[PDB]
Design a protein around this nucleic acid. Sequence first.
RNA 1: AAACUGGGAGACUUGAGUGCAGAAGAGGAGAGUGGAAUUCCAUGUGUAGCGGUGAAAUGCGUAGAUAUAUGGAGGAACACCAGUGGCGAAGGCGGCUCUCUGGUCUGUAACUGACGCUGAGGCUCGAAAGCGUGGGGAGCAAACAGGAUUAGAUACCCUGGUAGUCCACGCCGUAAACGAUGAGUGCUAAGUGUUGGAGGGUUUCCGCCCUUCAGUGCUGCAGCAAACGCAUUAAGCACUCCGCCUGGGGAGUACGACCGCAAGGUUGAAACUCAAAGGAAUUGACGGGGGCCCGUCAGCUCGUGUCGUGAGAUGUUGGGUUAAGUCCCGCAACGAGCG
Lengths: 66, 68, 131, 97, 163, 88
Amino acid sequence: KVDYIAANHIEYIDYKDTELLKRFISERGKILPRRVTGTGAKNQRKLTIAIKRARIMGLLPFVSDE
Amino acid sequence: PTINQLVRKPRKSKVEKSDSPALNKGYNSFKKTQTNVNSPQKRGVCTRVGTMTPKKPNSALRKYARVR
Amino acid sequence: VMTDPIADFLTRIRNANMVKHETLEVPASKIKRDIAEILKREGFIRDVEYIEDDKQGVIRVFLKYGKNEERVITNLKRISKPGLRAYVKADEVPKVLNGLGIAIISTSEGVITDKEARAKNIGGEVIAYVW
Amino acid sequence: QDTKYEIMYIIRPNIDEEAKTALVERFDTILKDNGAEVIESKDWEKRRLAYEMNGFREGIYHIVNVTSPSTAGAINEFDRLAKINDDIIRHMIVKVE
Amino acid sequence: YIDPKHLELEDRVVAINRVTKVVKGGRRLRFAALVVVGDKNGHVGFGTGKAQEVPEAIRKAIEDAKKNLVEVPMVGSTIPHEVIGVFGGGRILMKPAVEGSGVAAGGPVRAVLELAGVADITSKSLGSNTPINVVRATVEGLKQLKRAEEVAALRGKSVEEII
Amino acid sequence: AISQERKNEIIKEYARHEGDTGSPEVQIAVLTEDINQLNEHARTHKKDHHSYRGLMKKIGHRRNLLAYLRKTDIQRYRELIQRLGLRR
RNA sequence: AAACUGGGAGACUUGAGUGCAGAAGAGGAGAGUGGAAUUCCAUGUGUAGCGGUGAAAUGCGUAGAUAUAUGGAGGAACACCAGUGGCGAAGGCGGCUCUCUGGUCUGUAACUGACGCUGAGGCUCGAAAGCGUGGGGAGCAAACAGGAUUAGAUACCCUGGUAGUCCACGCCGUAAACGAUGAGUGCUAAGUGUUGGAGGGUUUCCGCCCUUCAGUGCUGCAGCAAACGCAUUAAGCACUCCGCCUGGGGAGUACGACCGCAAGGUUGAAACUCAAAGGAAUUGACGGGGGCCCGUCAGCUCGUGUCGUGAGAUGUUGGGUUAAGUCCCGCAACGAGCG
């Protein structure tokens, strides 16, 4: 379990690269805890702001069943 | 307290009171009633007589009077 | 904020004595050096060495222990305090612990022990009891 | 100095290819008339959406890059004009650093 | 260390206490005893024990009391200096007295003081007056008494240099 | 609240020698600029009780430094408080 | 006389502030905006129930309910993230974007040169409920109505339902407003988590080892405590300044005074009456407390030790086994008596 944002030395998150974001949300769209993904305390805050930003701009589903 | 608090406002003790307070009396003749004159006894006239029953758990009829 | 450096010195000595280890360091001062010499002359301290670099300090004290690691100073007390000062007259000089302990007094001719003061017949401010 | 923003809006899908240029140039102008130095303006991609916004499930994304002093009344003008249009669906203004 | 119990010792009762323990049905009762022990020469110990009758209790207590003993220095029928002994809510002050003045001391402390051969001393209890804690505080205060020789030895001095 | 160019702009005229960021003249002048700007912000946002705390603490700091300057040199004190426009 | 405290002329940089370079954050005020759900409305399909309880009933329904599908309207709260995590002097602060703004932490060593600490009287802020003026009003809900239950039920349970809960501006000024622990400063063993930084090494070290600041938790020593316990975030050792206490009732009452539209708040007695009222722990008995077992039960005590300031404890608790305090193993206990 290694912080994948520390795997690369990635500085900015940009809420647009929905390819990176899509691995922190479950198979239903809900945000996964800091445990099940092994990220840090502040990268988690940035990631959460990122995907909340994404959902509003219609890049990402709020709920996904239909 | 700090000794500065004590100097701002000193210590005050409690005031004691008798349990025979009707024995420091004064006349009711010319003006009014004076409190300096601690007595060992006082006299009076009995305005009634009779008996009364004590507290718990005694039992009797104890003689008494009322006196002016 | 610090308001009594003499009391701070005394409590360093007592705190490091009760835990029974063999060194101690304080920021220096003309009065603390005086009472460190008085503590050395009577037999409570083993030594005192004077380093000094760029601020006041420092003063290093070397405590002293018995033959079975028992303590030669048993307590230590500050008498005159900033907030209630204690002045003593030549016939009021105290005798701490029936002579088995010392008092420390500041007079017009030095900071001296309580024997040296009732031999000269003067008095002054009372710093401390160490018994 | 200044502050950098990134404006990102979503055009209507079913418009032609001249009203689109008209809209882009229109908003570039009305950014610049209030002292907002625009420094990039592009199209991005045609995507479908994760939910329908008004009745639309596709839209064209456009991003701009702009600096300005933090007090200029420019970047609020974009908001005030964008929420009353008919071809734009959403916008997000965001400080960039 | 152990002052070993091999002397001529005159004991003394200081207290007894009817003490119960409620069980199924009614009540049990024992007797607790507090005893002092010494030889009126400077060796004093205290000890307590309980049994079902008073003689058995006082016996077990003297048994216990002899296992402990303290040295109690003095300089001519008078304690060397002034001490304050504290043990759990019992505070006892003791002063050196004048030749032939006696012991002015309360109930529990005077037993302790008389069975160590103390002759002239003044006391006062600034605390609680439960016999056990008074006795324990008094013995706690004797243990602070310092001989004049030992002080001169610990420091680098001689006697007649600090007295 | 003042920018970092206003600040140096006004500490380059109440300095005494060069390299003079201390010197209670500098500190009370910069604090005066701050208190003015914060008074503006309070007039606009008068139910921001959490910024008024900082306003009051700045005022306390300035009054303390003024007391110090006075108790040690009255000439510098008078000249300042004339130059800066206070002492109502 | 001249050590200390006070006064006068100087000098210094460690306390305190400033500059320079960086870091984190549901700190505050204003203005917009998003999706999930509840309610009502409109329309299609659709047949007799739905709802509710320990059981029922009141209620809604054949003027077509509930369900189910699509569209609108309005209000309030922000799932996952989310954590003995973060921020704030406290009260408190959780969707997102922008504008205005307060404080903290870390490194450095330009600068000033004791500028510091505490703070009666005074001012500022202060959960919920409540009051005034004008808006808003979906869900919930004092008062109130109807149904039940009971000996009775002006309650608990069910169906409804008004103020209020929401916004702007004024007032009120109290809570178990709590860590029942005032603020500043120095000193005194160790072990282990987590939040934000700074240095050195190995160096993809950016994931590891060591050191070091500031927060936040757990365990534990000296010392302290009446025991409970506390313990570098002290309830330890010490100095400075403020607030407050002196048996229980009467009583936060009466009287006067200030404050408030009101409700009320702050200040604050005595006459008389009792010999107790309390804190913490101990052995029993009980519980409409819990767990293990079984179908003539298997329990009740003492001596010498050790533990506890003390009443007291241990043994007689724990694992296994047994019909069994019947046996074994372990254990400050080792043995004994009636069962």
